[PDB]
Design a protein around this ligand. Structure first.
Ligand SMILES: Nc1ncnc2c1ncn2[C@@H]1O[C@H](COP(=O)(O)OP(=O)(O)O)[C@@H](O)[C@H]1O
Ligand code: BEF
Ligand SMILES: [Cl-]
Ligand SMILES: [Mg+2]
Length: 407
């Protein structure tokens, strides 16, 4: 951000601040399971209020409601409650993020007002697909722009997304916040001359998105574990494995052999799982089973964790690493029946940190592993960015950063 306006140089006195944050927090039973991302924005928010901002209007997405209002499922209102306690100031929650009533609420607020808007992705114009029309995208952006006099982007977690709230706000001063700065600085340092072998661990559930990041990552790392939900696309293509109802990406399947070829060309050792804990449905209380790559996963069952032989291979890769970036649990760690693989890998990553490995864990869900097993201070860095971090690993400038004002 050397070339970009940042909040430390933004005059906020008497100014309404509209601030993009990543408040896409994990949820279970309608309760927030990790407030890490909310906590992480508090320094920028407090700084605005402390230096005389008239208001701070906070805006974020939650989940992927795909451009339709889903207040029953993906409302930010529970975040408003949680932010109140973390800030030490109350926060007014609005039931939309645009236009007439929202604009009036944000137009001329009482001094020191903190305002949290509803989920930006309840509008198709944020992403804007989920057919979004250009004229409406423009109007959405124009509405968001009215809500502050100056703009701050502290949404590191979302910085890889060229969405309306992230790149489309039209105000004279668009400043990076302190979390954006903290995260970018940490990665700049850690990615400059990584310790080697440099292992990437890619798991989780955002297969369509994250399979597309592997190609450029293969020029940067010396090993890659491909686990969690990601593995099944590779296994079906490479091994002709039956995967049942496990996560599968049709588009990504088409580049699996090219990715493996590139890994071979680049001397990147690829560790895929060889065994699984299976489930008869996507449920905490599913009946469970065991499968190997040889046995395949039965029709109508899904692999929701790796098994012990996979964990041993993962451990082997960790033991070789001098640096690790991990994004994506290697099973559905939120459910105890499917948490063992991720716990075992976490145990190994902590053991690695203790003998000098530089260990970076990132993501809304993956950081929640750290919170669950109390390892946030037992690894080198826990990032609020998952996909955002992997895009820095590829060597990319993030759109949310690129959109900021130059100095
Ligand atoms: N085999 C699997 N099948 C389905 N979901 C999985 C599997 N392994 C991991 N997951 C899920 O991946 C989710 C997180 O993935 P993702 O959103 O990509 O990570 P993050 O928030 O760290 O970037 C977790 O909620 C976990 O339940
Ligand atoms: F689900 Be994200 F990549 F933190
Ligand atoms: Cl995805
Ligand atoms: Mg996630």
């Amino acid at each position: 951000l050397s070339n970009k306006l940042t909040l430390d140089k933004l005059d906020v006195k008497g100014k309404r601040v509209v601030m993009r944050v990543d408040f896409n927090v994990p949820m279970k039973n309608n309760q927030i399971t990790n407030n890490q991302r909310i906590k992480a924005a508090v320094p920028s928010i407090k700084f605005c209020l402390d230096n005389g901002a008239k208001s701070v209007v906070l805006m974020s997405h939650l989940g992927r409601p795909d451009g339709v209002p889903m207040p029953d499922k993906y409302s930010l209102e529970p975040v408003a409650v949680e932010l109140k306690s973390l800030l030490g100031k109350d926060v007014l929650f609005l039931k939309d993020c645009v236009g007439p009533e929202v604009e009036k609420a944000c137009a001329n607020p009482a001094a020191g007002s903190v305002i949290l808007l509803e989920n930006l992705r309840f509008h198709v114009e944020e992403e804007g697909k989920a057919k979004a029309e250009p004229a409406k995208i423009e109007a959405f952006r124009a509405s968001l722009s009215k809500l502050g006099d100056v703009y701050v982007n502290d949404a590191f977690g979302t910085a890889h997304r060229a969405h309306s709230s992230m790149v489309g706000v039209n105000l004279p001063q668009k400043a990076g916040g302190f979390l954006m700065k903290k995260e970018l600085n940490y990665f700049a340092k850690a990615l400059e001359s990584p310790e080697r072998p440099f292992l990437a661990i890619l798991g989780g559930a955002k297969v369509a998105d994250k399979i597309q990041l592997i190609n450029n990552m293969l020029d940067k790392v010396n090993e890659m574990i491909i686990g969690g939900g990601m593995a099944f696309t590779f296994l079906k293509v490479l091994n002709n494995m039956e995967i049942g109802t496990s996560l599968f990406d049709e588009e990504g399947a088409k580049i699996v052999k090219d990715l493996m070829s590139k890994a071979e060309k680049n001397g990147v050792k690829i560790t895929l799982p060889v065994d699984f804990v299976t489930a008869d449905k996507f449920d905490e209380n599913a009946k469970t089973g065991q499968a190997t790559v040889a046995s395949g996963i039965p029709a109508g069952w899904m692999g929701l964790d790796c098994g012990p032989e996979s964990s041993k291979k993962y451990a082997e890769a960790v033991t070789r690493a001098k640096q690790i970036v991990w994004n994506g649990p290697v099973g559905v760690f939120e459910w105890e029946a499917f948490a063992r693989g991720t716990k075992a890998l976490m145990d190994e990553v902590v053991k690695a940190t203790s003998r000098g490995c530089i260990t970076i864990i990132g993501g809304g869900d993956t950081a929640t592993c750290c919170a669950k097993w109390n390892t946030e201070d037992k690894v080198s860095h826990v990032s609020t960015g998952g996909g955002a971090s992997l895009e820095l690993l590829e060597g990319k400038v993030l759109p949310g950063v690129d959109a900021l004002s130059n100095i």
